Amino acid sequence: PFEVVFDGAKEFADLIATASNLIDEAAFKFTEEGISMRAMDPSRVVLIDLNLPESIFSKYEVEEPETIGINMDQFKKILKRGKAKDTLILRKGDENFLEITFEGTAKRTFRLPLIDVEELELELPELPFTAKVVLLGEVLKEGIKDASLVSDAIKFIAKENEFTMKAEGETNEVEIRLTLEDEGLLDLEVEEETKSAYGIRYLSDMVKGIGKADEVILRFGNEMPLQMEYMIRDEGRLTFLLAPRVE
């Protein structure tokens, strides 16, 4: 059982909404260090991994490591009805429900039924990534936006001295090239030349929460999933793993 408090419900709501625009249910594991949410879209094309450390919570009390399972559409419709700086409370008893309490002005409570789930294993087994790219959000966002006008896939190429986002349609082609001389590329580490490709519709959703100045980390491999990590609204780390488009 546990009780957690966060000041500013709609902040917390928005935090959750961003982390979950691709998914329908997630497993939240509560430990001492903090909350780790893990999820997949039903097609199992994207893995979503969110960390919220103890620190960001007014009160944070967790007995033993516990993992609950939530219908995320259900959870969001409850968090929706969260004032701007009411305090948010999340009580978990011994029954498989979660108590969502919003306090301030008028205090209301709701009971969210959980999903039978076993303990979450918190990990992301080291995929043999061969390229690391670190770049500003503004650039990554504009790359995907631009590509979307032209295709529904985008191709990533990392070479020793350039990173390139490539999209080809029936109408035209668009390309973004970065070299270390551009302000938009902070790091480029390429153990061997690496090419892969990804669906835009997925990517578009993944980058929405990213702000123009945030550092984003990309790791991928040849015809391999993309890992994308960034810090979200000064709270914790969001990490996506996205399946590639191949052949």
Partner: protein, 35 residues
């Protein structure tokens, strides 16, 4: 000429089954909620 994939092809079978099960669990719980 670009075929989609899922993570089933890249992640351990056990991890996949977890969210597979989680999803089944989730679809069953679609209705009815207090206060």
């Amino acid at each position: 000429r670009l075929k989609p994939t899922s993570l089933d092809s890249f992640l351990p079978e056990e991890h996949i089954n977890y969210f597979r099960d989680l999803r089944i669990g989730s679809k069953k719980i679609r209705n009815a909620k207090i206060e």
